[PDB]
Amino acid sequence: VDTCSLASPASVCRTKHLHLRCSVDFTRRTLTGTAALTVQSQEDNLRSLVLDTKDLTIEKVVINGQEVKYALGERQSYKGSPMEISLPIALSKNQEIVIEISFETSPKSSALQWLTPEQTSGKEHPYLFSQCQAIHCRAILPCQDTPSVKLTYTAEVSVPKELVALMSAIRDGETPDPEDPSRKIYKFIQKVPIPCYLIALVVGALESRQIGPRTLVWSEKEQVEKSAYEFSETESMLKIAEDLGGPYVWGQYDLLVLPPSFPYGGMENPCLTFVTPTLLAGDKSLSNVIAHEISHSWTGNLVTNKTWDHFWLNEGHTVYLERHICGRLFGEKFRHFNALGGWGELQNSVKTFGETHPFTKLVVDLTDIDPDVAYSSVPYEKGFALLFYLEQLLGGPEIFLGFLKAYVEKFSYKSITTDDWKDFLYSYFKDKVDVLNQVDWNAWLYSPGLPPIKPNYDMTLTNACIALSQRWITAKEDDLNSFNATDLKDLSSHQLNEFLAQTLQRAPLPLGHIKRMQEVYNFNAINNSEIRFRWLRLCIQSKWEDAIPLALKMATEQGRMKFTRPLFKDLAAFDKSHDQAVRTYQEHKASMHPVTAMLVGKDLKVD
Ligand SMILES: O=C([O-])CCCN1CCC[C@H]1COc1ccc(Oc2ccc(Cl)cc2)cc1
Ligand SMILES: [Yb+3]
Numbered sequence: 377v378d379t380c381s382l383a384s385p386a387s388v389c390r391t392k393h394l395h396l397r398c399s400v401d402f403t404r405r406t407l408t409g410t411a412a413l414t415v416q417s418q419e420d421n422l423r424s425l426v427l428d429t430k431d432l433t434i435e436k437v438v439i440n441g442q443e444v445k446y447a448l449g450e451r452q453s454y455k456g457s458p459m460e461i462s463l464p465i466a467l468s469k470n471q472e473i474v475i476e477i478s479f480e481t482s483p484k485s486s487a488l489q490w491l492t493p494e495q496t497s498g499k500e501h502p503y504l505f506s507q508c509q510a511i512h513c514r515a516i517l518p519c520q521d522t523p524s525v526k527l528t529y530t531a532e533v534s535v536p537k538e539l540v541a542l543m544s545a546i547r548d549g550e551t552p553d554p555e556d557p558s559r560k561i562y563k564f565i566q567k568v569p570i571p572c573y574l575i576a577l578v579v580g581a582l583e584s585r586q587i588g589p590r591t592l593v594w595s596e597k598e599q600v601e602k603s604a605y606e607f608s609e610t611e612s613m614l615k616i617a618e619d620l621g622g623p624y625v626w627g628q629y630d631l632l633v634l635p636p637s638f639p640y641g642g643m644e645n646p647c648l649t650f651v652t653p654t655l656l657a658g659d660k661s662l663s664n665v666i667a668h669e670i671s672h673s674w675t676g677n678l679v680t681n682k683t684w685d686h687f688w689l690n691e692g693h694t695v696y697l698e699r700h701i702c703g704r705l706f707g708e709k710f711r712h713f714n715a716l717g718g719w720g721e722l723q724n725s726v727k728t729f730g731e732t733h734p735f736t737k738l739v740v741d742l743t744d745i746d747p748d749v750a751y752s753s754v755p756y757e758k759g760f761a762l763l764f765y766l767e768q769l770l771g772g773p774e775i776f777l778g779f780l781k782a783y784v785e786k787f788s789y790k791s792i793t794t795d796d797w798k799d800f801l802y803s804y805f806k807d808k809v810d811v812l813n814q815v816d817w818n819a820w821l822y823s824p825g826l827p828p829i830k831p832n833y834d835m836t837l838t839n840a841c842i843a844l845s846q847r848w849i850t851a852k853e854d855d856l857n858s859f860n861a862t863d864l865k866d867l868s869s870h871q872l873n874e875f876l877a878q879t880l881q882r883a884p885l886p887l888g889h890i891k892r893m894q895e896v897y898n899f900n901a902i903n904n905s906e907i908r909f910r911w912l913r914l915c916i917q918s919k920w921e922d923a924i925p926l927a928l929k930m931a932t933e934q935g936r937m938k939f940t941r942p943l944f945k946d947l948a949a950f951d952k953s954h955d956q957a958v959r960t961y962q963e964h965k966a967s968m969h970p971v972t973a974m975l976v977g978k979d980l981k982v983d
């Protein structure tokens with residue numbers, strides 16, 4: 377049972393295919409058209425079915441060339457409104473029919489962000505992008521909005537002719553629009569069955585540059601050169617991922633660099649990964665995000681969580697593969713550094729929520745919880761922690777990677793639960809079951825807080841970050857003179873970041889220490905978004921007023937929630953910046969991503 381969906385479940389009927397024909401109307405901020413769903417009955421004598429919708433205007437529903445009865449139920453908050461459709465003829469088990477629904481989105485669609493020309497790089501054209509995960513696909517089109525159902529799709533999208541449409545699918549050509557020659561129709565085919573949260577659409581003034589034998593980078597013209605360089609490791613990461621996961625089945629692996637308001641680091645849309653422009657550090661240092669999105673081509677897109685309660689299956693395995701990719705590229709010591717880093721991020725999350733909070737459980741219960749509100753690092757890092765602990769328990773990285781590849785093979789094209797996973801783990805490691813029985817499963821899977829066991833981490837690359845962080849934390853005023861730019865001499869960008877992360881865990885520090893840190897390390901000059909984020913949080917939590925305009929600027933000039941949410945929260949907790957934060961949020965709210973606006977509003981206790 378998917379408690380986040382109001383639609384008929386997979387045991388009742390299953391969508392096999394979507395044919396989407398729609399037109400993107402920038403004047404009205406609406407997507408209008410028809411979603412033709414090929415639906416297969418799973419029951420005898422099926423006479424109706426229910427679809428998810430959210431802020432959709434339904435014009436009509438046609439089956440067998442005739443309009444049929446349908447009814448929209450009462451809105452159920454963030455879940456939207458159920459759509460019951462009366463079938464004209466009862467279906468037997470396995471019988472398929474095509475249901476064509478004429479619809480229109482709301483400008484307020486929580487799936488979509490509509491951007492004015494001024495919010496783009498070029499300033500001459502508007503831009504649209506979607507984000508369906510977890511349950512926003514219903515805010516674009518009527519569907520069974522559950523990852524328990526997988527469907528193929530085709531789409532024809534009409535857009536102003538100077539713009540380009542892209543989707544999570546293979547590009548299938550373009551033509552002038554036969555009805556309106558000011559428009560183009562872009563065609564798309566996704567022949568691999570996918571859960572509907574992986575349907576994605578972007579429309580804007582996009583250009584492309586090839587960076588590998590199966591990868592183009594797409595963005596507005598002013599970001600193309602920078603993006604091509606930043607993501608040049610992509611093909612070599614795909615080859616490693618294929619080695620670990622098996623064949624890449626999706627054909628193309630393209631990248632789209634979104635405008636700065638994209639709410640996340642990345643999104644693993646099949647054939648077309650979406651990435652934040654905050655990755656454009658200039659030195660490829662934030663490329664683990666690409667490795668992570670690549671990994672989803674197996675863990676998430678092939679093997680999918682059956683409901684959102686099992687989201688950790690998607691993320692833990694993907695972070696696990698991610699860290700293997702970076703370990704192949706840069707060494708096993710680097711994999712351990714990143715893994716130990718992740719544990720720190722897990723400590724932070726658990727401390728933030730509280731150690732008994734239900735969202736610190738690996739397997740969660742999302743009944744009456746908005747998944748956007750539950751979203752955190754917990755399923756990523758507690759899920760990774762579990763796999764890493766199992767790896768060490770069961771004999772090492774190469775043994776456990778044998779299991780990961782067998783897992784992907786086993787559940788490819790399926791949607792699975794934690795029990796499916798656990799069962800297969802026991803099946804695969806039959807000769808090591810006694811060891812498996814030592815694991816405290818009820819704690820790992822179902823209890824809040826930090827895991828019952830912390831894995832073993834090589835400390836080599838972390839030691840210098842910890843030592844430097846500890847010098848600063850234990851420094852008194854008379855020690856401040858001893859710090860100097862040479863302290864940073866032998867630290868990579870990642871170590872610099874971890875140094876700040878270590879220090880941030882003990883924030884606030886005395887204001888005088890922070891002022892000195894700027895004087896000798898000039899952190900204000902660093903444009904690496906991850907480093908800058910932690911440095912600004914450290915400044916604001918340590919009550920440095922000078923940092924207020926910098927923190928406000930970063931919070932608003934990009935919209936990646938990882939950065940924007942804690943920056944607004946920190947600014948609101950600082951009495952000197954509190955009113956500015958609230959005011960800045962209020963003035964920016966209408967032009968923010970709708971999900972980001974909602975969550976920042978909640979964080980700030982506004983509107
Ligand atoms: O590949 C990635 O992990 C990129 C980060 C994921 N981003 C990409 C755009 C969408 C977003 C994931 O969005 C979600 C995903 C899952 C959500 O629901 C849950 C939130 C927490 C839990 Cl423990 C279970 C389910 C809610 C929102
Ligand atoms: Yb074709």
Ligand SMILES: [Yb+3]
Pocket residue numbers: 852854855
């Ligand atoms: Yb002293």
Ligand SMILES: [Yb+3]
Pocket residue numbers: 982983
């Ligand atoms: Yb108010």
Ligand SMILES: [Zn+2]
Pocket residue numbers: 668672690691694
């Ligand atoms: Zn992920």
